[PDB]
Amino acid sequence: SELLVNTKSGKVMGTRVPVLSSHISAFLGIPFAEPPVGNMRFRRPEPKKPWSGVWNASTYPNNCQQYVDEQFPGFSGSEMWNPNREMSEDCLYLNIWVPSPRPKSTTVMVWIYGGGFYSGSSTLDVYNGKYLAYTEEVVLVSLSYRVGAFGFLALHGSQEAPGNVGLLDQRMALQWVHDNIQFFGGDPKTVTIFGESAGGASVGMHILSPGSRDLFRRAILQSGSPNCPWASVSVAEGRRRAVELGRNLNCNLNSDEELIHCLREKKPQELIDVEWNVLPFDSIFRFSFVPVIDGEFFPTSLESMLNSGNFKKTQILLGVNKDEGSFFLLYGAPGFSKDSESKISREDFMSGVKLSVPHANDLGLDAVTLQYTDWMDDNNGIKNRDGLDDIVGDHNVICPLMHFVNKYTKFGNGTYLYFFNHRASNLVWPEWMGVIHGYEIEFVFGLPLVKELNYTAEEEALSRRIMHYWATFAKTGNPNESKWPLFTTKEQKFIDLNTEPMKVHQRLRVQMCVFWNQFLPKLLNAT
């Protein structure tokens, strides 16, 4: 049976799914690790013991235990990212979409979802890539990991809760792919891992981490970097804010053992309830429990590794969205609302920049402002709003990416950089949000291909042409078969990704990023 597959972990039964006038097979819910429940909570991932029967992979599995959004109940735009299956601590599983008839050795793609490391799901409608596997003819794999304290609590030193376990799940899922993806038709030596936000930062974290580079070939990073300010905390910070969690749930903090035990006694939702209370400051685009530069998963500091080319060298295709910051300002800054032009005032603006560069001192905040302010019309509300939408993206996404790009592209074997700036015609979010964080994925996963979803023809055509870029690159190591230029430390070329005739530019946000990537940091140290 085309749906019956024999893995190194046991036989597994798949299911036939319809895909744009055709059909293919999907093996949903396959388990790659032991349930991270109970005493194992906070512990590193555990390999999944073999099953002596036939595992049923016809239905998506539970979503991990995570903070669910309720700022816009009903509203699809928000609920569209919320978990869509019974959340549970038993969540480490993976789904595989295999073409039909089943291949013998085709390009494999492994997807790592985002969520600020505090949220995420592999079972999201937008992540349903039966279209990618289908259209592009690849074997799409959707790994899943532990987000939240459940998978990032960093009580460094302790072995019961060392941190980064969530990245470890990611890794134990890439091994499984490396070990059995052949029995599914995939080619274990041509496996591309691609992700968004925290998933894009995880991708590159696997390029840096010595223990996982050998587990994949090339990578695609979307709106994320490992050297992103919110992508990691120190072992001290993780420690300090891990204790603050015990303190919040009234735990015993006499010693790690007591704490860890206590935290392991609290139900999941109790941890979730006081999760955000441990952050060091009032901030925008900052999350509680994220990877720690522990010295193991990460030999040394990220920068120093990017400086010594101490990272996996291969091909990488990456980029950013035109309007990243939007989502975090509407959700955190004062003066923003889902149902207005949210034109901001010098005040609200000045107050937002403090929420954006939280680690900045007053001289710093000054630099930022003077930098993103049209002093010829400093009262423009639409300007104050947009310039604020630029500080959130620039500082948290584009600039940290452009530094990892320039550093990688000096040891890597090839780099392709894009700037996606097309506003889905059916977006529901207020126009003032522009090309929003995470709204390229739908083009990447070919949702514009399914009619009922309301997309122009021009749009379905971008998805189709973007999907081939991703897929062609994943298989050949180059997006091309009209040409998307190679990014070089010399002519830093990149292109635009939208329904208009390909246009090639060069040096994505140089200026703003020279300030973020070079000036600000310096200043903030002198001062």
Ligand X SMILES: *C(=O)NCCCCCCCCN1C[C@@H](C)O[C@@H](C)C1
Tokens read off for 20:
């744009």
Give the range of 121-129, 232-240, 304-312, 326-334 binding ligand X by CB under 6 A.
326-334
Nearer to a copy of itself, 419 or 455 (CB): 419
Query: Which of the choices a copy of itself, ligand X, none does residue 198 contact, using the CB cut-off of 5 to 8 A by kind?
Result: ligand X
Residue 328 interaction partner, one of ligand X, a copy of itself, none, beta carbon < 5-8 Å per kind = ligand X
Cα–Cα distance list, 164 to 294, 384, 525 (Å):
8, 38, 28
Closest CB to ligand X among residues 76, 159 = 76
Q: Work out whether 321 is an interface residue with ligand X (CB under 6 A).
A: no
The nearest distance, CB 82 to ligand X, in angstroms, is 10
Cβ-based nearer residue to ligand X, 331 or 411: 331
Contact residue for ligand X among 21, 52, 71, 482 (CB under 6 A): 71
Could you tell me the smallest distance in angstroms from the CB atom of residue 396 to a copy of itself? 20
* Nearer to ligand X (CB atom), residue 327 or residue 418: 327
Q: After which residues does a break in the chain occur, C–N more than 2.5 Å?
A: 481
Give me the 451-490 binding string for a copy of itself, x by CB under 8 A, dash otherwise. Answer: ----------------------------------------
Which two tokens mark 317? Answer: 């295709």
C-alpha dist (Å) from residue 466 to 121, 221, 474, 486: 23, 14, 12, 16
The entry of ligand X, a copy of itself, none near residue 281 (CB within 5 to 8 angstroms by kind) is none
What minimum distance in Å lies between the beta carbon of 166 and ligand X?
A: 13
Stretch that binds ligand X, among 41-49, 114-122, 251-259, 406-414 (CB under 6 A): 114-122
Q: Which CB, 79 or 237, lies closer to ligand X?
A: 79
Of these, 4, 236, 428, 510, which contacts a copy of itself (CB under 8 A)?
A: 510
Among 366, 383, 453, 476, binds a copy of itself (CB under 8 A): 366
Which of the choices ligand X, a copy of itself, none does residue 375 contact, using the CB cut-off of 5 to 8 A by kind?
a copy of itself
Report the alpha-carbon distance of residue 347 to residue 373 in Å, rounded: 12
How many residues in total does the chain contain? 527
Number of CB atoms found within 10 A of residue 347's CB: 11
Least distance in Å: CB of 34 to ligand X? 26
The residue (of 370 and 457) whose beta carbon lies closer to a copy of itself is 370
3-state secondary structure 411-426: CCCEEEEEEECCCCCC
Residue 193 to residue 216: CA distance in whole angstroms:
7
The region of 87-95, 118-126, 422-430, 506-514 touching a copy of itself under the rule CB under 8 A is 506-514
Applying CB under 6 A, which of residues 36, 61, 99, 115 lies at the interface with ligand X?
Answer: 115
Query: Could you tell which of a copy of itself, ligand X, none binds residue 115, using a CB distance below 5 to 8 A set by kind?
Result: ligand X
**Side chain identity at residue 129, one-letter code:** G
Q: Long-range contact list for 242-247, CB < 8 A, 24+ apart?
A: 242/149, 242/153, 242/154, 242/155, 242/161, 242/278, 242/289, 243/155, 244/277, 244/278, 245/149, 245/153, 245/271, 245/274, 245/275, 245/277, 245/278
Do 119 and 130 meet the contact criterion of CB atoms below 8 Å apart? Answer: no
114 counts as binding ligand X under rule CB under 6 A: yes
Query: Closer CB to a copy of itself, residue 461 or residue 524?
Result: 524
Report in angstroms how near the CB of residue 357 gets to a copy of itself at its nearest.
15
The count of C-alpha atoms lying within 13 angstroms of the C-alpha of 483, restricted to the half-sphere facing its C-beta, is: 5
Contacts of 109 (CB under 8 A, 6+ apart): 129, 132, 138, 139, 140, 141, 191, 192, 193, 194, 470, 471, 474
Q: Which two tokens stand for residue 271?
A: 């941890």
Orientation angle between helical segments 198-208 and 165-180, nearest 10 degrees: 70
- For the CB of residue 171, give the shortest distance to ligand X in the complex, in Å: 19
Q: Does 518 bind a copy of itself (CB under 8 A)?
A: yes
Residue 510, both tokens:
């140089």
Asked whether position 75 contacts ligand X by CB under 6 A, the answer is no
Which does residue 376 touch among a copy of itself, ligand X, none (CB within 5 to 8 A, set by kind)? Answer: a copy of itself
Nearest to 498 by CA among 430, 405, 435: 435
**Range in contact with ligand X (rule: CB under 6 A) among 146-154, 166-174, 323-331, 484-492:** 323-331
Q: Which residue, 187 or 324, is less far from ligand X as judged by CB?
A: 324
Instruction: Based on the shown chain and the rule CB under 6 A, indicate whether residue 276 belongs to the binding site for ligand X.
Output: yes
Sheet holding 54-56, edge to edge: 4-7, 10-13, 54-56
Q: How far apart are CA 233 and CA 250, in angstroms?
A: 24
Binding of a copy of itself by 375 (CB under 8 A): yes
CA atoms within 13 A on the CB side of 274: 17
- Contact between 103 and 56 under an 8 Å Cβ cutoff? The reply is no
Task: Give yes or no for residue 197 binding ligand X (CB under 6 A).
Answer: yes
Q: How far apart are CA 115 and CA 196, in angstroms?
A: 9
Contact between 69 and ligand X per CB under 6 A:
yes
Among the listed residues 331, 514, 340, the one whose alpha carbon sits nearest the alpha carbon of residue 437: 331
Active-site residues, by number, are: 197, 324, 437
Judged by the rule CB under 6 A, the positions of this chain that interact with ligand X are: 69, 71, 114-116, 197-198, 276, 327-328, 331
- Residues interacting with a copy of itself, by CB under 8 A? 361, 363, 366-367, 370, 374-376, 507, 510-511, 514-515, 518-519, 522-523, 526-527
